[PDB]
Write a protein that binds this ligand. Structure first.
Ligand SMILES: [Zn+2]
Lengths: 191, 229, 49, 93, 187, 48, 53, 286
């Protein structure tokens, strides 16, 4: 089958609990993680999935493992503190990709961003240049918004994404009554 | 100890956990302990050895028994397994016979040529580099030393006028206890002079007493250095 | 005072030392004590009934 | 003064604090009552002995004196060490 | 030339290379042209605890002192009976190579305490040393009868001796019978 | 220190031979759970 | 202790009643050769360091 | 809480193993392992431990990598085979103390009880004690600075239980025991001066430099007490200690008398035998 590693980042902030959009969509995207990890389990059960947040202090809840049994139990106690962090959130994952068991597995990291980026364009294009240098697949997913959806983020993705052929895809979800599951299941990255 | 006691899935699991880490080495064998009945191998032991040697032709066997082993020597003897089809030809077709004298450390007159049938052993040597040497030597020297090293010295230096003094008095007591016999000695020296019926040396012990007496002189300069600067 | 002689129930006689934990208070003779198979140390004593 | 005749007298104290010689006993009694000074004078004839005290905030001349006394102590210990070890290494080892 | 190299490689951690320095300086200083080497040779012989450099010690000594056969047994007289048997073995090789081809009896009369020891190494070395002397020698001039008999007893004593003992024994006996007394060795 | 291993030998018993045999195998009378009959060492004659 | 049959060697009885043959160390003098005395060997080496009254 | 701790050479030799299995990486940064011991008793005792992969980032110093699963597995199996030892704290081989170490220790501060930090050197060129035990506690600051994790120095000693001494002594065959006498004592009396020399020289220079030339208020207040300790000895004239010198020199005189007398006793047999044996050997020679 397909050999790759899956890294999912969840937003522990209070912006996910807002009353306009979904009623604490954290559980919804949790169910998304569940159905996509069960999908990967059905396809290639030998894949491991790690879990960490975007907050200031990076704390791994569960190390990468093929068994999601205890992971489902570790999906709780999100510890709703902090706001957002980007750079070290990347450096705690992409640099930690070398701690995986199988060396034949491809590097794949996604993210759930529910908060505005505090970092300027410089750090963005630099980190994008780094990820492009080490050649790691990155899928940008943003749940909820305040300011304009894509402004510098477009150029960010374009500069971050190399190998136009069968490369990474950008996921942009607008406001709506529908869930995020079938919406993030639309690209080829899911299933 | 049994072949059933070893869990294959747990084994392979731990080995895999060693593979994902910085320890990429295959198992070279297995070791155990045989307390109090001797370091030899029983039926079950040689059977599970026969079962575990199916993979590795070498299968190094090591048996440690510190219980009856004196703390004077930690020297251990590794074990090997001879083939059952070699009974027709010679026993051990091994070169370099110069190390058999080093393998003669188990000089016991029972177990060796007693169990020598279909059984033998192998020589043991060590290896040390500069890093381990310097590190362990410095660590051991520090273990026999103090943190700042100036702490417990001046303590004894100032204890020379309290503790050591009593020990010096006792030393004078024992020395006098020797001297009272030394008063009887010149009579014997004026009588026999042929042969020594007294195993007591009377010399080296008093020399050692002087060695313990030199502590004051050696720590005197120490106190001088402390007082000066 | 530091090291004394012990008598086993089976009849062989031995000698032991003093542990840094226990003190010389209960170390006095006339009291049945306990020993260990390793180093022959003393965890505690054995009061008669 | 960290050195050079630490021994003092009540004259300077009475001159600075503009107090008589009768109240200096109660003064040092209060000083020992607070507990910031361990000073105890064994004197018979008129004298003042001093003891350990806390630097607290800072002093510049005591910093200069610190680096000075420290450099002197260091070069003395070094000099003695080299001097002794010079023959000690050769004749003993 | 290589003095600095040997001096630099003398402080090396490797025992094998430490012996290699002595083996290297051995043939270089042959002819007894340097009295400096024997200083650190004997120094590293006595001081160092490892028996490797100790048994590799006096070989170079015998190599450089090979000029005078008489002076060797005097200074190796202390190494006749040593603490560790390896030193006695190396000293046996020393008396073997130094007294080889000569008529010096200083080793010969000292071979009697050497031929019997609780350790087999020093015994074998004594057999070799006894093999490297009696070759090319007249029996009428000196009483070699004793050592010849004790050497001829080695083959009948093989049953009561060590397996390597009879090895070094017949190996020592192969020296005298070599070439049928026709061919010999000279340093 | 070479005798130290003979100290590790855990001592030695006291043998008593009540009878000698012509098979050159000496029987020894010992404390109960004793009586171990075996030929002596080769360097020492039996008839002595 | 039981008896000394020769020089620097003797026999020693155990608690079980079984007599043991052990050669004494050269350091030990002839004072410990007394026919009747309380002797203490090692639990392993079976050597006598000192005797007690 | 803990007055002193006991650190066995086995863990530092495991660090030697860490410098062993490297296999020429070209990175060789600080490696964080997991120390094990007994926190039950007042005095800490170290038996054995294991190793966990630890990596950081070049630029960003806030990057630290640990493993919960591997830790729970190793500690689980270790607890399975031996229940007499549990988790205590961690240690690093880094010569310098990084700011991220509080965040690294915070994990074991949460999941486990209070952890002790140990700092050693990658290259054993340090003559002083390689192991420094640092307890992690929260202390009230006098200056009023916000409460943060503070590392306090705890005294330690290097020792072994039973067999480890034998193993070390056998593997070395170089180092000597206490051995009261001339050389063993005089060696110390010689080299100790250098032991103080190199240390003090390595200290007071960086001290003098960083005091005047530096910033980041590490609370210099304790160094006034340092200088105070340096001022605790205001050049005593020894005038009061003259009697003590007299008593010490009197003891020296006692040593003189003892030495002379004892040597005079020893000279007996020598100065007898040297005559009586030689004259008899000479007269019986021919
Ligand atoms: Zn058993």
């Amino acid at each position: 089958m397909v050999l790759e590693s899956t890294m999912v980042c969840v937003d522990n902030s209070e912006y996910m609990r807002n009353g306009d959009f979904l009623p604490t969509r954290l559980q919804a995207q949790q169910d998304a993680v569940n159905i996509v990890c069960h999908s990967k389990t059905r396809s290639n059960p030998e894949n491991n999935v790690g879990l960490i947040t975007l907050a200031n202090d990076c704390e791994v809840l569960t190390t990468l493992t093929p068994d999601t049994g205890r992971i489902l139990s570790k999906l709780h106690t999100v510890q709703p503190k902090g706001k957002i962090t980007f750079c070290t959130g990347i450096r705690v994952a992409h640099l930690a990709l070398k701690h995986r068991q199988g060396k034949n597995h491809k590097m794949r990291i996604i993210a759930f961003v529910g908060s505005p980026v505090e970092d300027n364009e410089k750090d963005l294009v630099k980190l994008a240049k780094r990820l492009k240098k080490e050649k790691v697949n990155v899928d940008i997913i943003n749940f909820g918004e305040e300011e304009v959806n894509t402004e510098k983020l477009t150029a960010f993705v374009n500069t971050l994404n190399g190998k136009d052929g069968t490369g990474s895809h950008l996921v942009t979800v607008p406001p709506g009554p529908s869930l995020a599951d079938a919406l993030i299941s639309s690209p080829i990255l899911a299933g | 100890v049994s072949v059933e006691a070893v869990d294959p899935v747990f084994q392979a699991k731990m080995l895999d956990m060693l593979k994902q880490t910085g320890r990429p080495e295959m198992v070279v064998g297995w070791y155990h302990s045989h307390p109090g009945f001797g370091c030899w191998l029983s039926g079950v032991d040689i059977n599970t050895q026969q079962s575990f040697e199916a993979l590795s032709e070498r299968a190094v066997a090591v048996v440690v028994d510190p219980i009856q082993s004196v703390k004077g020597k930690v020297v251990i003897d590794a074990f090997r397994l001879i083939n059952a089809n070699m009974m027709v030809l010679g026993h051990e077709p091994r070169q370099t016979t110069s190390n058999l004298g080093h393998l003669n450390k188990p000089s016991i007159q029972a177990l060796i040529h007693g169990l020598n049938r279909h059984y033998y052993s192998i020589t043991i040597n060590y290896r040390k580099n500069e890093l381990e040497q310097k590190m362990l030597l410095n660590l051991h020297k520090k273990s026999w030393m103090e943190g700042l090293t100036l702490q417990d010295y001046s303590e004894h230096c100032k204890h020379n006028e309290s503790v050591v003094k009593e020990m010096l008095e006792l030393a004078k007591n024992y020395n006098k206890a020797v001297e009272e016999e030394d008063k009887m000695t010149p009579e014997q020296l004026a009588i026999k002079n042929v042969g020594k019926q007294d195993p007591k040396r009377h010399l080296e012990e008093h020399v050692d007493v002087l060695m313990t007496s030199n502590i004051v002189q050696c720590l005197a300069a120490m106190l001088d250095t402390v007082v000066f600067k | 005072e530091e090291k004394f002689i012990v008598k086993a129930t089976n009849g062989p006689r031995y000698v032991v030392g003093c542990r840094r934990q226990l003190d010389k208070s209960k170390l006095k003779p006339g009291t049945r004590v306990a020993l260990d198979m390793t180093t022959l140390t003393i965890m505690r004593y054995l009061p008669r009934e | 003064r960290p050195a050079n005749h630490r021994q003092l007298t009540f004259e300077e104290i009475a001159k600075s604090a503009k107090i008589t010689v009768n109240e200096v006993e109660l003064l040092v009694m209060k000083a020992l009552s607070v507990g910031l000074v361990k000073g105890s004078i064994d004197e018979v004839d008129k004298r003042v002995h001093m003891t350990w005290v806390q630097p607290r905030v800072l002093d510049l001349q005591q910093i200069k004196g610190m680096k000075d006394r420290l450099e002197f102590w260091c070069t003395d210990v070094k000099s003695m060490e080299m001097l002794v070890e010079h023959q000690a290494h050769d004749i003993l080892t | 030339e290589a003095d600095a190299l040997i001096e630099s490689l003398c402080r090396d951690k490797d025992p094998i290379l430490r012996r290699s320095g002595m083996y290297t300086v051995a043939m270089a200083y042959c002819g007894s042209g340097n009295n400096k080497a024997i200083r650190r040779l004997l120094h590293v012989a006595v001081s160092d605890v490892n028996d490797d450099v100790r048994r590799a010690a006096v070989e170079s000594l015998g190599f450089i002192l090979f000029r005078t056969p008489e002076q060797c047994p005097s200074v190796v007289s202390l190494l006749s009976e040593s603490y560790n048997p390896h030193v006695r073995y190396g000293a046996a090789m020393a008396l073997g190579i130094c007294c080889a081809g000569t008529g010096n009896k200083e080793a010969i009369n000292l071979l009697e305490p050497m031929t019997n020891d609780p350790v087999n190494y020093v015994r074998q070395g004594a057999l070799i040393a006894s093999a490297l002397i009696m070759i090319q020698q007249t029996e009428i001039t000196c009483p070699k009868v004793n050592q010849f008999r004790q050497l001829y007893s080695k083959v009948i004593n093989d049953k009561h001796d060590d397996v390597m003992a009879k090895f070094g024994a017949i190996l020592a006996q192969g020296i005298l019978d070599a070439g049928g007394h026709n061919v010999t060795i000279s340093l | 220190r070479e005798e130290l291993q003979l100290l590790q030998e855990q001592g030695s018993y006291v043998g008593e031979v009540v009878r000698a045999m012509d098979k050159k195998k000496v029987l020894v009378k010992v404390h109960p759970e004793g009586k171990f009959v075996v030929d002596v060492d080769k360097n020492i004659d039996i008839n002595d | 202790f039981l008896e000394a049959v020769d020089q620097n060697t003797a026999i020693v009885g155990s608690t079980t009643g079984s007599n043991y043959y052990v050669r004494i160390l050269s350091t030990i003098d002839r004072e410990l050769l007394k026919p009747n005395a309380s002797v203490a060997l090692h639990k392993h080496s079976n050597a006598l360091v000192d005797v007690l009254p | 809480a803990v007055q002193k701790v006991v650190v066995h050479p086995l863990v530092l030799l495991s660090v030697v193993d860490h410098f062993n299995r490297i296999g020429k990486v070209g990175n060789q940064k600080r490696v964080v392992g997991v120390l094990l011991g007994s926190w039950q008793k007042k005095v800490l005792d170290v038996s054995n431990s294991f190793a966990v992969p630890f990596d950081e980032d070049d630029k960003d110093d806030s990057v630290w990598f640990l493993d919960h699963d591997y830790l729970e597995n190793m500690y689980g199996m270790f607890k399975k085979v031996n229940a007499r030892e549990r988790i205590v704290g961690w240690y690093h081989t880094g010569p310098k103390l990084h700011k991220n170490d509080i965040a690294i220790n915070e994990l074991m501060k949460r999941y486990c009880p209070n952890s002790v930090l140990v700092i050693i050197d990658v290259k054993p060129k340090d003559l002083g004690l390689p192991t420094e035990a640092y307890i992690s506690v929260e202390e009230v600051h006098d200056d009023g600075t916000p409460t943060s994790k503070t590392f306090e120095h705890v005294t330690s000693e290097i020792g072994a239980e039973e067999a480890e001494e034998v193993g070390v002594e056998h593997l070395l065959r170089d180092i000597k025991d206490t051995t009261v006498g001339t050389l063993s004592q005089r060696i110390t009396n010689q080299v100790h001066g250098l032991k103080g020399l190199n240390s003090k020289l390595l200290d007071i220079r960086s001290y003098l430099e960083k005091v005047a030339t530096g910033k980041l208020p590490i609370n210099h207040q304790i160094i006034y007490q340092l200088q105070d300790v340096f001022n605790l000895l205001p050049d005593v004239s020894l005038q009061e200690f003259v009697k003590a010198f007299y008593l010490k020199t009197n003891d020296q005189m006692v040593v003189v008398y003892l030495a002379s007398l004892i040597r005079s006793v020893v000279a007996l047999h020598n100065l007898i035998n040297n005559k009586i044996a030689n004259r008899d050997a000479e007269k019986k020679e021919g």
